Amino acid sequence: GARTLEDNDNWRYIPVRRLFNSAERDIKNAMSFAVFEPNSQPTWERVRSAVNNYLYSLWQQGGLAGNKPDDAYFVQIGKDITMTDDDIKQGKMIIKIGMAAVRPAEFIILQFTQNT
């Protein structure tokens, strides 16, 4: 058995939830170097570079699905996309990440016949 307690199209399987938790922790750790740095475009570019590097490594390991990295993940960060002027004035950096996971095969059906 590899199911969680929520029978939903998302988070039905333990691997998906655990992978997403690990990815969240790693992405939070990766961008923590940007504190007390200017809340401007170069810092966002560096954060995007680090996040993209981590996501590409994860995809190349086989964690994500898709034939090319563009099919596996996307990263958005910048003004008018994830942050507003009020958010910037408060020193908050917001980044959005999407990922695609591979789901396991749970039921295998064998259909036997005699006509061959």
């Binding site: 475009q41 170069p42 570079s49 680090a50 993209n52």
Partner: protein
């Protein structure tokens, strides 16, 4: 009316960051992507050419020597057998004021393979300059 003309970015407006810190360099080169070519020929005249295996990245960075500064040599000197700390390099082309990024070169998993000390010449009036060579995995260009 109003024909618009754009000129290419000057080559000196770049900023280099190694790992998670910014280091003022003097010259960066070698960010090339190379693919082998695989060829197959048939007796009836078919000639198939396809991309082959991607090659690794060789990058050389150049900078002057400053008092109390040995980060690059400390990085290369930390090698024990096959163990070394691999870092990500990022070279970005900025605007004139340096407050915006126009293009970024992303280099992943680069480790030092060679260090060049200054050529001590008592007959020269130039600055002492060190060099480091890195081997990486893959380079990617992203437009900001």
């Amino acid at each position: 009316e109003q024909i618009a003309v754009e000129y290419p970015i000057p080559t000196y407006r770049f900023v280099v960051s190694v790992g998670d810190e910014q280091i003022p360099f003097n010259n960066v080169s070698g960010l090339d992507v190379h693919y082998d070519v695989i060829e197959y020929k048939d007796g009836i005249g078919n000639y198939y050419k396809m991309p082959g295996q991607r090659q690794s990245i060789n990058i050389t960075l150049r900078k002057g020597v400053f008092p109390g500064d040995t980060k690059l040599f400390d990085w290369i000197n930390s090698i024990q057998l096959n163990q070394v700390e691999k870092k990500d390099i990022a070279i970005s082309l900025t605007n004139e004021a340096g407050t915006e990024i126009l293009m970024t070169w992303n280099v992943a998993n680069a480790f030092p393979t060679s260090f060049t000390s200054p050529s001590f010449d008592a007959t020269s009036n130039e600055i002492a300059v060190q060099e480091i060579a890195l081997t990486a995995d893959r380079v990617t260009i992203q437009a900001a």
